[PDB]
Design a protein around this motif. Structure first.
Motif, PDB file in Angstrom:
ATOM      1  N   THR A   1       8.448  -5.394   3.939  1.00  0.00           N
ATOM      2  CA  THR A   1       7.421  -4.462   4.136  1.00  0.00           C
ATOM      3  C   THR A   1       6.572  -3.380   4.013  1.00  0.00           C
ATOM      4  OG1 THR A   1       6.769  -6.136   5.964  1.00  0.00           O
ATOM      5  CG2 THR A   1       6.671  -7.484   3.822  1.00  0.00           C
ATOM      6  N   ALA A   2       5.362  -3.176   3.576  1.00  0.00           N
ATOM      7  CA  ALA A   2       4.834  -2.168   3.628  1.00  0.00           C
ATOM      8  C   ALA A   2       3.188  -2.511   4.205  1.00  0.00           C
ATOM      9  CB  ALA A   2       5.052  -1.462   3.105  1.00  0.00           C
ATOM     10  N   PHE A   3       2.449  -1.291   4.777  1.00  0.00           N
ATOM     11  CA  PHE A   3       1.202  -2.011   5.052  1.00  0.00           C
ATOM     12  C   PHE A   3       0.560  -0.861   4.984  1.00  0.00           C
ATOM     13  CE2 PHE A   3       1.532  -6.500   6.169  1.00  0.00           C
ATOM     14  CZ  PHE A   3       2.843  -6.482   5.277  1.00  0.00           C
ATOM     15  N   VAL A   4      -0.550  -0.838   4.642  1.00  0.00           N
ATOM     16  CA  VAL A   4      -1.641   0.609   4.647  1.00  0.00           C
ATOM     17  C   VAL A   4      -2.977   0.253   5.408  1.00  0.00           C
ATOM     18  CG1 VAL A   4      -2.458   1.790   3.468  1.00  0.00           C
ATOM     19  CG2 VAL A   4      -1.069   0.841   2.637  1.00  0.00           C
TER      20      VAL A   4
ATOM     21  N   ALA B   1      -5.609   1.262  -1.804  1.00  0.00           N
ATOM     22  CA  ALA B   1      -3.981   2.277  -1.997  1.00  0.00           C
ATOM     23  C   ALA B   1      -2.663   1.550  -1.952  1.00  0.00           C
ATOM     24  CB  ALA B   1      -4.501   2.501  -0.466  1.00  0.00           C
ATOM     25  N   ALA B   2      -2.740   0.124  -1.827  1.00  0.00           N
ATOM     26  CA  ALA B   2      -2.074  -0.440  -2.439  1.00  0.00           C
ATOM     27  C   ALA B   2      -1.525  -1.464  -3.381  1.00  0.00           C
ATOM     28  CB  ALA B   2      -1.993  -2.326  -0.944  1.00  0.00           C
ATOM     29  N   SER B   3      -2.368  -1.172  -4.150  1.00  0.00           N
ATOM     30  CA  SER B   3      -2.713  -1.365  -5.938  1.00  0.00           C
ATOM     31  C   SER B   3      -1.113  -0.327  -5.894  1.00  0.00           C
ATOM     32  CB  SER B   3      -4.318  -1.510  -6.206  1.00  0.00           C
ATOM     33  OG  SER B   3      -4.052  -1.896  -7.587  1.00  0.00           O
TER      34      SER B   3
ATOM     35  N   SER C   1      -6.076   1.466 -10.851  1.00  0.00           N
ATOM     36  CA  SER C   1      -4.798   1.512  -9.321  1.00  0.00           C
ATOM     37  C   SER C   1      -4.007   1.852  -9.107  1.00  0.00           C
ATOM     38  CB  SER C   1      -5.917   2.056  -7.912  1.00  0.00           C
ATOM     39  OG  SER C   1      -4.909   2.496  -7.218  1.00  0.00           O
ATOM     40  N   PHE C   2      -3.879   0.242  -9.568  1.00  0.00           N
ATOM     41  CA  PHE C   2      -2.182   0.044 -10.599  1.00  0.00           C
ATOM     42  C   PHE C   2      -1.508   0.331 -11.462  1.00  0.00           C
ATOM     43  CE2 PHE C   2       0.489  -2.836 -11.969  1.00  0.00           C
ATOM     44  CZ  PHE C   2       1.338  -3.556 -11.310  1.00  0.00           C
TER      45      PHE C   2
ATOM     46  N   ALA D   1     -17.442   5.892  -3.783  1.00  0.00           N
ATOM     47  CA  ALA D   1     -16.939   7.059  -3.061  1.00  0.00           C
ATOM     48  C   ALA D   1     -15.426   7.048  -2.004  1.00  0.00           C
ATOM     49  CB  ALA D   1     -18.189   7.457  -2.425  1.00  0.00           C
ATOM     50  N   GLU D   2     -15.705   6.698  -0.617  1.00  0.00           N
ATOM     51  CA  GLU D   2     -14.016   6.623  -0.653  1.00  0.00           C
ATOM     52  C   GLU D   2     -13.066   5.850  -1.425  1.00  0.00           C
ATOM     53  OE1 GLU D   2     -14.737   4.010   3.147  1.00  0.00           O
ATOM     54  OE2 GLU D   2     -15.130   5.660   3.675  1.00  0.00           O
ATOM     55  N   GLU D   3     -13.248   4.940  -2.224  1.00  0.00           N
ATOM     56  CA  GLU D   3     -12.433   4.889  -3.370  1.00  0.00           C
ATOM     57  C   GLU D   3     -12.318   5.419  -4.425  1.00  0.00           C
ATOM     58  OE1 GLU D   3     -12.862   0.835  -4.707  1.00  0.00           O
ATOM     59  OE2 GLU D   3     -13.862  -0.078  -2.768  1.00  0.00           O
ATOM     60  N   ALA D   4     -13.212   6.491  -5.393  1.00  0.00           N
ATOM     61  CA  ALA D   4     -12.553   7.394  -6.325  1.00  0.00           C
ATOM     62  C   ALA D   4     -11.958   8.833  -5.453  1.00  0.00           C
ATOM     63  CB  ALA D   4     -14.291   8.058  -6.845  1.00  0.00           C
ATOM     64  N   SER D   5     -12.767   9.238  -4.482  1.00  0.00           N
ATOM     65  CA  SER D   5     -11.959  10.638  -4.067  1.00  0.00           C
ATOM     66  C   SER D   5     -10.386  10.005  -3.472  1.00  0.00           C
ATOM     67  CB  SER D   5     -12.562  10.805  -2.344  1.00  0.00           C
ATOM     68  OG  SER D   5     -13.681  10.549  -2.812  1.00  0.00           O
ATOM     69  N   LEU D   6     -10.495   8.613  -2.692  1.00  0.00           N
ATOM     70  CA  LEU D   6      -8.614   8.334  -2.585  1.00  0.00           C
ATOM     71  C   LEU D   6      -8.035   8.239  -4.069  1.00  0.00           C
ATOM     72  CD1 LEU D   6      -6.641   6.732  -0.589  1.00  0.00           C
ATOM     73  CD2 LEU D   6      -7.386   4.556  -1.769  1.00  0.00           C
ATOM     74  N   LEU D   7      -8.370   7.897  -4.881  1.00  0.00           N
ATOM     75  CA  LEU D   7      -7.642   7.402  -5.774  1.00  0.00           C
ATOM     76  C   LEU D   7      -7.265   9.386  -6.859  1.00  0.00           C
ATOM     77  CD1 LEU D   7      -9.473   4.596  -8.288  1.00  0.00           C
ATOM     78  CD2 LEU D   7      -6.794   5.084  -7.169  1.00  0.00           C
TER      79      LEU D   7
END
Lengths: 323, 323
Positions: free
Chosen positions: A40-43, A60-62, B62-63, B89-95
């Motif tokens: 496993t791996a977790f974020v 992030a997991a996606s 993301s996937f 905004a947090e998800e867009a910057s993460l991607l």
């Protein structure tokens, strides 16, 4: 004992956000190959400071699930009390579908009064909101339908797309954040994830209360697989490994544990986790696992500043798992 | 003319959720290979029925981003009026960070009165909430800081993690859902994505209103790259291709356009898009692109029941792209 990874993604002084996220991505890509025995791996989720730059662990997991083939990946502490349960249920079912059953739903209550204010959540009814949000979220994952008529959510019955294949067998974990949450989790027979930054006594006290509440409610917990996130920093110089770990956790401890003796908190964590040389015993960490009923151990090497030593360490751990 | 893909992910009678999502995943994996000249791919958002089973397009993107290396992938119509702008905004910057600048943020206002009630959003202020929500998310994406002090959001100044590298160069698109949104988008010089299910006249009226408002406000729109999602069904039997498309869109038309003539709406869409044999001209679709200023065309072959015929068509289109 099952083995896995977890990532806090701390952005220390001088580090860039790209280096931090590249480390997680490259470590998961390497460990995903078949010769490794990590499963496993977790974020981890965190907001509003550099002590954890991943604000959306399921997103992030996606990405990580799309990048890999063997590992099961999920969130470590998706906070549901400040989020919408229908949206989380939709994302969990989608990841279950797209990754062919490799997504793990680690959950958490809110542990920051600032976040409760930021997202307009009532403080005094927090426990009741956490449970109302879980019931909606768990309904959608296991039945593909949500319905709510209470003091926090009220909406008609709707379907959750896509339809979840795993349903009740989609692994869920609960971050041990308070006695109220741990007792609630014991009555449901749900496995715990312990806060990495808590003291050993705190985790052992949580586990003992978990055993008591489950016995009083006749809940079978013989196969409940609790999880222990273990920070690791192994260096031939004991002082190098201890100082790098102090530089890694100091900021978060000041942020998340402001009303405690800062210096004692840090030193207790250096003893509890695995910070030292390769020839040490780390019986405090073995004691920690046994006395918290942890059947899964999650490793993080993110405080080590020598990446070639980290890969060397991962292979050493992997070989002993084969034995 | 730039070419790309978009996915509605309709789960028709007898289809499973897995088959629908496997089709998107396998189509994107094939097109991402270097021999192809498609540049983008988009995921559509829909809730509470099988007329679109992806409720979280940014999580799905993301996937797909983790699975690919060349294509740029994003959401087609992420609804911001019913979501939290800081979370987006947090998800867009993460991607942006994890995918090395390959995420595209296609946005949309809410187009379902049911969803406005479901997520407790006031109808009378829908347009004003849409604009306040965009400002917060766009601030965070381009400056890594969010702040709000109005009647929809009020919170202190906070940082958005992780650090966004693309910032102002992160491509944003706005779904043309009403005259109010199109005019608001014209003043900002932001490119449009047209609703696939709208009539041709509706799209041309949107484009003409976009040109008018931009000229009145001295906004430079010479390089604005509007987007046209085009449904495609090519079959040697013209009657088979027309029936497969009728069975694909009928449910959604009844759901999203309830107060209109269903049969006229469907036939207009059969004329507007590319539904027929391979030897036809489809001058109605070319007219559609020209009169909407579309510089990007997004293709969907999802109504065709022969997946091998779809791949053959993709290769035919691909060869014509490289002249």
């Amino acid at each position: 004992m099952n083995f896995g990874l977890f990532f806090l993604n701390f952005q220390l002084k001088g580090m860039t956000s790209e280096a931090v996220l590249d480390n997680m991505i490259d470590t998961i890509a390497l460990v995903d190959k078949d010769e490794y025995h990590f499963k496993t791996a977790f974020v981890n989720e965190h907001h509003f400071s550099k002590n954890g730059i991943v604000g959306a662990p399921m997103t992030a997991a996606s990405f990580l699930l799309g990048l890999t083939e063997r590992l099961h990946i999920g969130s470590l502490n998706q906070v549901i009390t400040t989020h919408h349960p229908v949206r989380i249920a939709e994302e969990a079912s989608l990841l279950d579908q797209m990754s062919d059953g490799r997504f793990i739903l680690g959950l958490s209550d809110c542990v920051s009064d600032f976040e409760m204010d930021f997202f307009k959540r009532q403080r005094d009814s927090q426990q009741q909101q956490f449970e109302a949000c879980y019931e909606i979220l768990n309904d959608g994952i296991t039945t593909n339908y949500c319905y709510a008529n209470n003091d926090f959510y009220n909406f008609p019955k709707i379907s959750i797309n896509p339809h979840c294949i795993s349903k009740e067998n989609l692994k869920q974990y609960i971050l041990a954040t308070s006695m109220g949450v741990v007792e609630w989790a014991a009555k449901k027979g749900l496995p715990l994830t312990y806060r990495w930054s808590d003291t050993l006594a705190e985790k052992e006290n949580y586990y003992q209360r978990y055993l008591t509440v489950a016995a009083e409610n006749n809940v079978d917990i013989t196969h409940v697989d609790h999880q222990f996130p273990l920070l690791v920093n192994i260096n031939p110089d004991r002082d190098i490994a201890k100082q790098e770990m102090r530089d890694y956790i100091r900021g978060y401890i000041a942020e998340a544990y402001p009303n405690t003796d800062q210096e004692e908190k840090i030193e207790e964590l250096i003893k509890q986790h695995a910070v030292g040389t390769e020839d040490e015993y780390y019986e405090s960490s073995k004691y920690a696992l046994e006395k918290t009923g942890s059947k899964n151990v999650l490793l993080s090497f993110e405080s080590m500043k020598n990446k070639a030593a980290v890969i060397d360490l991962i292979n050493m751990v992997n070989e002993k798992i084969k034995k």
